[PDB]
Amino acid sequence: DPKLNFSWPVNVGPLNPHLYSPNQMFAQNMVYEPLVHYNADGTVGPWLAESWEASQDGRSYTFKLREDVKFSNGEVFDAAAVKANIDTVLQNRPRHNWLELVNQMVSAEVVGPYKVRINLKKPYYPLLQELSLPRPFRFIAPSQFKNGGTADGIVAPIGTGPWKLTETKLGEHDVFTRNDSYWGPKPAYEQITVKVIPDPNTRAIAFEAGEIDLIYGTEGPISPDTFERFQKMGIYNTELSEPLETRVLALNTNHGATKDLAVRKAINHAVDKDTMIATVLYGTQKRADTLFADNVPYANIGLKPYAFDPALAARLLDEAGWTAKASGDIREKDGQPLAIELCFIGTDAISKSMAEIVQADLRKVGIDVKLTGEEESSIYARQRDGRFDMIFNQTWGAPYDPHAFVSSMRVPSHADYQAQLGLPDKAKIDAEIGQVLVSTDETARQALYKDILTRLHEEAVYLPLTSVTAMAVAKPEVGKITFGAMSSEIPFEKLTPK
Ligand SMILES: O=C(O)CN(CCN(CC(=O)O)CC(=O)O)CC(=O)O
Numbered sequence: 358d359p360k361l362n363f364s365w366p367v368n369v370g371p372l373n374p375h376l377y378s379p380n381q382m383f384a385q386n387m388v389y390e391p392l393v394h395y396n397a398d399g400t401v402g403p404w405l406a407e408s409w410e411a412s413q414d415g416r417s418y419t420f421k422l423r424e425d426v427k428f429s430n431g432e433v434f435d436a437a438a439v440k441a442n443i444d445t446v447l448q449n450r451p452r453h454n455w456l457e458l459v460n461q462m463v464s465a466e467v468v469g470p471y472k473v474r475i476n477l478k479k480p481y482y483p484l485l486q487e488l489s490l491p492r493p494f495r496f497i498a499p500s501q502f503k504n505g506g507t508a509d510g511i512v513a514p515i516g517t518g519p520w521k522l523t524e525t526k527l528g529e530h531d532v533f534t535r536n537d538s539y540w541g542p543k544p545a546y547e548q549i550t551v552k553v554i555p556d557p558n559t560r561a562i563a564f565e566a567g568e569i570d571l572i573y574g575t576e577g578p579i580s581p582d583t584f585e586r587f588q589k590m591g592i593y594n595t596e597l598s599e600p601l602e603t604r605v606l607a608l609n610t611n612h613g614a615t616k617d618l619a620v621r622k623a624i625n626h627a628v629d630k631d632t633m634i635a636t637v638l639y640g641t642q643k644r645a646d647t648l649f650a651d652n653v654p655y656a657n658i659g660l661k662p663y664a665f666d667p668a669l670a671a672r673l674l675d676e677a678g679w680t681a682k683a684s685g686d687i688r689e690k691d692g693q694p695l696a697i698e699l700c701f702i703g704t705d706a707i708s709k710s711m712a713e714i715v716q717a718d719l720r721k722v723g724i725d726v727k728l729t730g731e732e733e734s735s736i737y738a739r740q741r742d743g744r745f746d747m748i749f750n751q752t753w754g755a756p757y758d759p760h761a762f763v764s765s766m767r768v769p770s771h772a773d774y775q776a777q778l779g780l781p782d783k784a785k786i787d788a789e790i791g792q793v794l795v796s797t798d799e800t801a802r803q804a805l806y807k808d809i810l811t812r813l814h815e816e817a818v819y820l821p822l823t824s825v826t827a828m829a830v831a832k833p834e835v836g837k838i839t840f841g842a843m844s845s846e847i848p849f850e851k852l853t854p855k
């Protein structure tokens with residue numbers, strides 16, 4: 358029974374299974390479990406539910422539950438528990454109605470001691486995938502409710518999962534202890550200590566001094582130069598994942614110079630992503646040329662990349678009326694200079710390093726990118742108002758992409774909707790997104806996703822940049838390195854020391 362030291366930039370949170378920030382998804386994933394399980398091969402399999410049947414119309418799903426599960430406090434996991442959980446989520450729809458499964462779900466019914474029926478307004482093909490997510494459909498013991506729910510807080514974070522939160526010291530650490538009565542396989546580590554360490558350089562120093570045993574994260578747990586250093590050094594186990602969600606810039610089709618398709622195409626041709634990846638990222642993320650990568654369901658449709666071609670960029674601009682005067686000037690149209698704001702939350706280190714590169718590259722073709730690294734509330738306001746020319750965004754990874762991310766494009770207060778608002782075919786895109794989510798036919802789903810994604814690509818709504826990757830670094834004694842099936846999943850339970 359070894360112990361593991363991990364680190365994270367913030368405390369894990371109160372670990373409410375049905376709330377969002379400040380609860381950390383990786384930690385929710387350690388404690389609470391779903392009815393069905395997303396696998397790395399894209400399939401969804403049994404988990405708390407052993408099997409399930411679907412009505413002829415696809416509107417009702419009856420889930421047969423395992424009869425050998427208990428919450429970490431000894432309380433029985435059963436159909437009434439699953440109902441009480443779903444009900445408190447459905448009593449709080451405004452927090453959850455970003456998730457289309459919630460919108461479709463009507464009721465949960467107990468139809469046997471270990472059998473739960475879920476009823477929907479319509480057949481909804483992402484049902485099983487969205488039931489597998491970190492939240493909100495995972496299960497706390499109902500004895501832990503307050504006011505008959507979880508929206509106003511919980512007594513203690515009691516789940517059925519392989520780890521229990523046993524100690525929290527604010528600003529210092531969160532300690533997870535192995536659930537010794539877990540229903541599934543027994544984890545080889547008895548304890549994970551998550552040390553709260555906010556700065557990535559501080560994290561590397563702590564790692565080299567033997568105070569942290571494993572680095573693992575998708576948002577730069579250490580700097581790219583440090584990852585490079587570690588790997589060359591050749592004493593550690595180091596690995597990068599396959600491509601996860603895509604980092605993009607969204608270009609505003611409804612606002613500023615990006616209203617012009619020719620400007621958006623020029624932008625996509627003038628940024629040297631290969632150099633950006635080689636210099637600032639040291640090869641730790643793969644170039645992305647489309648909104649979704651080839652490994653996303655329905656997304657491998659053979660779209661043609663916008664090649665790095667700065668001369669072509671120049672030409673398109675010229676024929677849009679954006680012309681220069683002397684060599685090295687900012688282009689002008691109708692006595693209006695080609696100035697474009699690029700927005701990102703100012704504490705986001707990776708985004709900042711990328712923004713600076715985008716600025717330099719576009720400057721070579723006559724575009725004055727004005728960098729705006731702002732405070733979070735200021736950025737949020739811009740997103741809803743559509744008050745941006747270019748703004749950083751990213752997809753959601755597995756198993757959210759593409760269904761849940763395209764679904765969010767429909768919401769007026771979102772950056773993706775605001776950026777797409779100037780497209781002549783915006784209404785048709787949104788109507789097709791709705792149709793694809795409730796389609797019961799695979800041929801139709803392929804055609805629909807192909808059309809939606811082709812329009813977004815051919816209209817140059819996005820500047821795709823890179824594929825996010827989980828980076829992992831570990832002393833060899835920790836053992837083999839495995840990546841979670843989901844972006845947010847850190848499989849501590851699969852680590853086997855030595
Ligand atoms: O974070 C939220 O409150 C809701 N999420 C919903 C989609 N999420 C999953 C989640 O938060 O449960 C994507 C993500 O955070 O990775 C929206 C977002 O990140 O834009």
Ligand SMILES: [Fe+3]
């Ligand atoms: Fe989220």
